[PDB]
Design a protein around this ligand. Structure first.
Ligand SMILES: Cc1ncc(COP(=O)(O)O)c(CN[C@H]2[C@H](O)[C@H](O)[C@@H](OP(=O)(O)OP(=O)(O)OC[C@H]3O[C@@H](n4cnc5c(=O)[nH]c(N)nc54)[C@H](O)[C@@H]3O)O[C@@H]2C)c1O
Ligand SMILES: Cc1ncc(COP(=O)(O)O)c(CN[C@H]2[C@H](O)[C@H](O)[C@@H](OP(=O)(O)OP(=O)(O)OC[C@H]3O[C@@H](n4cnc5c(=O)[nH]c(N)nc54)[C@H](O)[C@@H]3O)O[C@@H]2C)c1O
Ligand code: NA
Ligand code: NA
Ligand code: NA
Ligand code: NA
Ligand code: NA
Ligand code: NA
Ligand code: NA
Ligand code: NA
Lengths: 386, 388
């Protein structure tokens, strides 16, 4: 009845898949490059690199910084992150030996708490990995003011807020790099898929290398990684130059992605009409608070946070919703800091406390938003949550 | 002249029918076809378990990572792992990515695999693992290798991405190790667009693999599992429960469907490839200036290597030009001597055992041409006329 996701595909995605089958060219190639070109143009970045998933997009975004001619990050360098996000926003950090400093969320926007950040940022701060949660962008004016002239790298995990904007600028393009996901239930879907955008040429070339075996095939002749490639094909076929991975996306995902990008403006439009209806329906709810919008959110889903002293218990809310046929979820990692076990592998610290994340973990959950009008489902959702 | 490219399509109507079936279903994310494929995969090779992943590179990544995650961790940073000097780039990276101390050992110029004698010399009390690689279809001699280990605490891993279908002593390559990796890239034994697989007989490793393949969550773990012991019944609780630092390297449902079809054809593909190898060997056996690969067990012959004989006055670049002129696609023998890679090596904590002169000689004098699952008699005659 009210599922988290639905299909974003029509006949065009199916015909694109058919074009690839017809071409018999399956390995990352022409459609992926065209998709990358369109993607960068769509969100306003100079360059885009498509990868296997938004999670390998995050992996290369962190890895890239160790491989610049002059490394931008090194083991033990401190990186600041919000206490609530997806697991693979944090794993790469652990995988590359960074010192993770968690900062609390603001219970209203669900994004990193700006006042807490202002205090967490010190001279030891090397990067801030922001997360635009559930479609809602971070106020980049405030964040950039905090950074100021400091040598702190801004990064964005934008896997939940494709299409979101702040001051007419697309989320994902504020950081030195920004990542996106095109998994099934996201704003666009390419079966699986992710993308890294950047305007930095060295970074872009490093990404081209580390995505595909750390080889030079995808680098241009004149490039920041190897300088100038040899004109001899045998010489540049298996030439390995950086410790990377094979995280190439498939030509089908690229082909499908191109059609999705064309539908994106309408998807965001509908998703925002859904949010308007929803917020109007929930504006003055007796016991539930909704996400507070920054810039223009792309509304990935609709969160609820049980109001304090409402007496309301989350467990029951969930039953009710489920019992009513309404799919729901926790708000992603909820408080990631509760993963004591996995945290055993990290080099980390917590700035101040993550009191809001804790409250969220126990009092929040989310229901779906889609690229199709959901007025009936929202009406029902409000009734069920009488 | 003649068209003799490195690889050709291994698909027929059946692979397209499989894709159609996924399309009709509307379920694209890793599911039932992948599950089925893993079941068939394990059976095909004789392992208890199989875990399909996005590529043979991500299969190697998970193979190494899992060893850090067992309840009693089987490896830790700085631990010593020995690997041959020649293989694929992604055989090496995960090693550096997990902060291991890599010990390089020369290859045998005949088999193209790790030099046994050198391996025997290299194994010390500090040796924690041996990451064997069955090159170009050729399995390692696991008897000799196991003798060397001699009931000592050294884990054996195999990177079997180039030797699907090889056997040694009636045992399938990939199954000698605690773990074994395979690739299903286009130019490989079977092809699922991109694809990899890790096989093991270890239930803990199997579960660790299932967790780290997908977000480090518990979704794909059974209620009772070696990672979290016992799952909660409350799904809201197990919805997004994160327990091991993993990745998202899931394969696509289409890849699993295609793969099932591919596994049925494999035996025939191996048959054709070996008959091609027979003709090739008969044709190049007394070549005046080129050595071929010496077979161990029953090779699956991924491709046909050549190494210019010392003192021949023959130059690789020439043969390369010659081959291309003829329309014969060729490649260096994979990484060649990986030790030349100062650019990548600067990020490693490694050492070299003795020397890698053979790997060096191969690096300057070696190359390979293709083998396919379709007869290549004319193409081989042609190749023999070109390399005259
Ligand atoms: C020891 C070891 N360990 C791990 C790995 C990594 O496995 P993985 O590649 O991550 O799955 C490997 C991988 N080795 C493979 C890698 O898979 C590598 O990508 C592959 O290199 P390649 O043969 O030079 O890749 P290629 O130039 O893309 O494909 C060779 C020919 O096939 C053609 N081709 C590739 N894909 C397609 C396709 O989809 N359609 C058509 N028509 N032709 C295709 C290309 O045009 C070439 O003519 O061969 C290497 C030896 C390995 O050797
Ligand atoms: C901050 C952040 N950073 C990084 C990432 C990683 O990106 P990525 O997932 O690696 O691309 C993410 C990823 N977030 C997503 C991930 O995409 C994650 O996998 C997802 O969890 P999920 O919504 O529970 O994914 P699911 O339960 O497997 O599928 C969602 C619904 O859609 C349905 N569905 C999924 N795939 C298909 C399909 O192929 N066909 C059909 N018909 N239905 C499908 C399922 O039945 C579910 O009801 O939602 C999370 C919020 C992120 O949030
Ligand atoms: Na949704
Ligand atoms: Na700080
Ligand atoms: Na930008
Ligand atoms: Na959507
Ligand atoms: Na081949
Ligand atoms: Na075995
Ligand atoms: Na190199
Ligand atoms: Na013929």
């Amino acid at each position: 009845n009210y599922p988290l996701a639905s299909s974003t595909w029509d006949d065009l995605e199916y015909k694109a898949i058919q074009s690839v089958l017809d071409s018999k060219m399956f390995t990352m190639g022409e459609y992926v490059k065209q998709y990358e070109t369109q993607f960068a143009k769509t969100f306003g970045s100079k360059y885009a690199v498509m990868v296997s998933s938004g999670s390998t997009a995050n992996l290369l975004m962190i890895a890239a910084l160790f491989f610049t001619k002059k490394p931008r990050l090194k083991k033990g360098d401190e990186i600041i992150v919000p206490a609530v996000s997806w697991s693979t926003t944090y794993y790469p950090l652990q995988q590359y030996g960074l010192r993770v400093k968690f900062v609390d969320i603001d219970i209203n926007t669900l994004n990193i708490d700006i006042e807490s950040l202002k205090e967490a940022v010190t001279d030891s701060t090397k990067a801030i990995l922001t997360v635009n949660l559930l479609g809602n962008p971070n106020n980049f004016d405030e964040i950039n003011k905090i950074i100021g002239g400091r040598d702190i790298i801004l990064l964005e995990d934008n896997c939940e807020s494709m299409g979101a904007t702040f001051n007419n600028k697309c989320a994902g393009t504020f950081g030195l790099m920004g990542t996106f996901s095109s998994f099934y239930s996201n704003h666009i879907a390419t079966m699986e898929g992710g993308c890294i955008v950047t305007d930095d040429e060295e970074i872009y070339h490093i990404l081209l290398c580390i995505r595909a075996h750390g080889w030079t095939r995808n680098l241009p002749k004149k490039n920041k990684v190897t300088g100038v490639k040899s004109d001899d094909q045998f010489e540049e076929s298996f030439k390995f130059v950086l410790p990377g991975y094979n995280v190439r996306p498939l030509e089908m995902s690229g082909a499908i992605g191109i059609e999705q990008l064309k539908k994106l403006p309408r998807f965001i439009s509908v998703r925002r009409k859904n949010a308007e209806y929803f917020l109007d329906k929930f504006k003055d709810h007796p016991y539930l608070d909704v996400q507070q919008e920054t810039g223009e959110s792309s509304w990935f889903g609709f969160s609820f946070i049980i109001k304090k002293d409402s007496g309301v218990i989350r467990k029951q809310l969930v039953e009710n919703l489920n019992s009513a046929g309404i799919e729901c979820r926790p708000i992603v990692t909820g408080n990631f800091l509760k993963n004591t076990d996995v945290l055993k592998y990290f080099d980390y610290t917590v700035h101040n406390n993550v009191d809001n994340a804790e409250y969220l973990d126990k009092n929040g959950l989310f229901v779906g938003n889609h690229q199709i009008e959901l007025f009936d489902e929202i009406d029902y959702l409000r009734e069920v949550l009488k």
